[PDB]
Write a protein that binds this ligand. Structure first.
Ligand SMILES: Cc1cc2c3c(c1C)C(C)(C)CC=[N+]3c1c([nH]c(=O)[nH]c1=O)N2C[C@H](O)[C@H](O)[C@H](O)COP(=O)(O)O
Ligand SMILES: Cc1cc2c3c(c1C)C(C)(C)CC=[N+]3c1c([nH]c(=O)[nH]c1=O)N2C[C@H](O)[C@H](O)[C@H](O)COP(=O)(O)O
Ligand SMILES: [Mn+2]
Ligand SMILES: [Mn+2]
Ligand code: NA
Ligand code: NA
Lengths: 465, 465
């Protein structure tokens, strides 16, 4: 049973983990180092000597797509499509195996002894309001079913034992809380947060499984074995037995705090807003605990890289519905969800428009995607040289652009005319068939596949780089 | 095992079948009578004395939605949603049970003895080219899989032993033929057509199951028992053992004939066009054979009524994908597929636009639907009094209308600017939320559910009608 430490050893053996012994400040400096590292596609980083703390800080864990694949037990990034077919089928799944004891409860501190200032919580960007917890798996139950939701919600430090719980309203945690308030007026909402669980559990948290299903069950499928958990000390929620640190407590109904500003995955600061306060009554941890953290900012960042790997999971699901789709890609540069490029085997005049409408309606992850570019299958969706070529040689802008107004848009997207509402643009860059054009369309240059294959074979021997 | 005769007895016992003993001409007159009957919601009709023939003609079999439900073994039309959930799951299924002999091969005629003029084939409308077979289950195999497709394709009489096979190019039969031609150049394509099978087999033929699956297998699920078949005499295709009449033969590669004009479900004539010729080498039938027929024309007609019952099947499938959908209805007046009304529990600004795009992209049956009206759940989608009310009180036409151009359109829709290509219109008639409008929206009048329930209870006793 691989916990997180086993994963770090695996990475270190493969030159995918680097230990920093120099003094480095959790205030701003770690983010700067990790940002350079990620942008050059370097290793995961373990800062063994954070200025002013004894607990090492692990970050950039999932800063390459390879390391996301490795964290699901697979060799490479193409294996992620198979986990996508699996995800199709859930739309008996395996419960958790509850241990009687666990390393994450070796050292326990509670009540007045709780001090989150002892943890090397990072400050990411210069005008961020305060230190911010960024890799917490938040565990909740609602009042109406047994299912335990795991989510990643950022958490601002506001006291020795107070965090802000910044879940957006469509998240599992926020729905569970909202229902608890209606169904049990005035009663404290139990909550627990696990830091540094095994990678299958972490990636399971972030994969959008149904709300009906526990993210613990999915992680079991990725792992091949049941997720090992332990009952929390102060509530009936279960947390991963291998966790490095666990926070337990509750949300007092009505209690809220102004959150942020914080730099966001779009590369801008979110302005201040109110969210629930999470009161921390217990902090449990391993001997030798490692603090797992990250940051978001201008893309690409670790979330963006996670998001590119998880898009591979969705390709199969889309292809099941739309078998004409050859590839489907959401570039990191587009803030991970705002632009999609789709390639198809076009079969009839107008086909591109059906595909756009499918991207905008089929799955909710893409409901808010404001640019969609559709191309033929001779275009590599992942290369702007091909995509721009297609746009500039197969479109007449006014004929081939679809605009739709008053559509749902992310409420934090300041570029839309009104919060929550905006337009979308679809670019039909497919070759135009009779009916779509009265001109003689051009015959595109295709490569000889035998020449390509021969050059693949002798490429290393050629030794050009 | 209910064959068709058992179904007719069931109908007759319930006042849903009427026998006509007066002389009535298959040329034009039967259509006129059936049209009046259907438009007044009357029974199925068995003309025992067709002028100039000895074989009775059965028509308007499925001219009420009730009779469609009855033909699936169910009591009423609401049960069709359950067959819809079933249809969701197929996306072991049961093979056919092959009998050693069958009533449909009691009287056999072949080669030079084949005369389709002995059958009371109907002429539907005054300017139709020729008599037309309208309720044939066409059975085919492709060369690449075992699966037997059943489809209903209209067939013009052009000789003693020649029919035109008018399958549109996306039908199972037409794809099977097309592949046969590529895979076995110049070889005759075996084909067989069953007239008057049991109602589960007929409705199975017309339900859009996957191309992967045999329509015979679905009929088995509707029935509860395997579809009983018999091997054809002249090929390896299987036809329903209970069939009243079966035509066997082949399509000679390259041989085509000008088809029509024929009046169509839109209420207009299709102009002439070429289709493959089906050469009939055998005609098998029961003692006492009954000829099953119908017509299409200005809606509503039997196809339209079939189509309304089968839309009930799709509601669940749509709801699985889009749980906000409360109801989804394609009125017969809109030529059965050209306009849809959808009602939703609206949950956010812009929601109607996601739903429109789903209707236009999720299922292929609705890819060609050119008007979509979206309303809230206080509107009965099936009552133009509600729908027009919603349109006229909740829309500003220019703000709330979505137009999209150069989308796929049915090639026979003469109203589009170019064959196969046209625009679509979505009307967002939902209540507008903040963001969508800066005005104070109106509070709609809701009825007291206790008053409604009380009036349901005393309604018969009130005896107003
Ligand atoms: C990986 C990751 C995902 C974050 C995230 C972060 C990371 C590292 C941070 C901490 C660096 C900064 C932004 N975080 C938030 C977030 N979702 C959210 O509602 N609030 C957030 O603050 N997301 C997304 C959220 O965790 C995922 O969408 C989950 O799949 C939601 O699960 P649920 O649908 O069960 O609630
Ligand atoms: C019930 C019914 C369906 C007709 C039909 C008729 C009826 C009575 C007629 C005979 C009265 C006049 C129009 N017919 C045609 C037709 N489809 C087609 O390609 N050509 C047709 O001529 N349809 C539709 C076709 O039979 C159904 O769409 C099948 O589900 C197609 O099956 P497939 O997808 O397996 O080919
Ligand atoms: Mn979840
Ligand atoms: Mn079929
Ligand atoms: Na989650
Ligand atoms: Na069919």
């Amino acid at each position: 049973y691989n916990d997180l430490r086993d994963f770090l050893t695996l990475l270190e053996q493969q030159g995918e983990l680097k230990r920093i012994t120099l003094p480095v400040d959790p205030h701003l400096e770690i983010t700067e180092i990790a940002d350079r590292t990620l942008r050059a596609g370097g290793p995961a980083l373990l800062f063994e000597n954070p200025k002013g703390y004894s607990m090492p800080v692990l970050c950039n864990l999932f800063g390459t797509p390879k390391r996301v694949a490795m964290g699901m037990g697979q060799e490479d990034v193409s294996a992620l499509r198979e986990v996508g077919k699996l995800l199709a089928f859930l739309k008996l799944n395996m419960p958790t195996k509850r241990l009687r004891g666990a390393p994450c409860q070796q050292k326990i501190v509670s009540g007045d002894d709780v001090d989150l200032n002892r943890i090397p919580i990072m400050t990411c960007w210069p005008e961020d309001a305060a230190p911010l917890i960024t890799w917490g798996l938040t565990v909740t139950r609602g009042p109406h079913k047994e299912r335990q939701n795991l989510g990643i919600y950022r958490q601002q430090l506001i006291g020795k034992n107070k965090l802000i719980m910044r879940w957006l309203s469509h998240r599992g945690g926020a729905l569970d809380y909202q229902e608890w308030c209606a169904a049990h007026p005035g009663e404290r909402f139990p909550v627990s947060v696990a830091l540094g669980a095994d990678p299958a559990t972490i990636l399971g948290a972030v994969t959008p499984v149904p709300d009906t299903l526990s993210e613990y069950a999915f992680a079991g499928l990725l792992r091949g074995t049941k997720t090992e958990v332990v009952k929390c000390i102060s509530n009936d929620l279960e947390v991963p037995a291998s966790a490095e640190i666990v926070l337990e407590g509750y949300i007092e109904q009505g209690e809220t705090a102004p959150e942020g500003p914080y730099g966001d995955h779009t590369g801008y600061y979110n302005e201040v807003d109110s969210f629930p306060v999470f009161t921390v009554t217990h902090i449990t941890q391993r001997e030798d605990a490692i603090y797992h953290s990250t940051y978001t900012g201008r893309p690409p960042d670790e979330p963006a890289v996670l998001g590119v790997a998880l898009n591979e999971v969705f390709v199969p699901i889309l292809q099941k519905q739309f078998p004409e789709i050859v590839d489907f890609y959401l570039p990191p540069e587009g803030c991970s969800y705002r632009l999609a490029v789709v390639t198809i085997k076009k079969q009839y005049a107008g086909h591109a428009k059906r595909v756009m409408m499918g991207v905008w309606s089929f799955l909710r992850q893409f409901m808010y995607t404001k640019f969609v570019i559709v191309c033929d299958d001779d275009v590599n969706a992942r290369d702007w040289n091909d995509v721009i070529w297609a746009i500039t040689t197969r479109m007449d802008p006014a004929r081939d652009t679809v605009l739709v107004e008053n559509t749902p848009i992310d409420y934090l997207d300041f570029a839309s005319p009104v919060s929550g509402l905006g337009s979308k643009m679809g670019l039909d860059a497919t070759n135009k068939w009779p009916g779509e054009t009265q001109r003689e369309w051009g015959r595109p240059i295709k490569k000889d596949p035998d020449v390509v294959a021969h050059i693949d074979a002798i490429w290393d021997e050629l030794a050009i780089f």
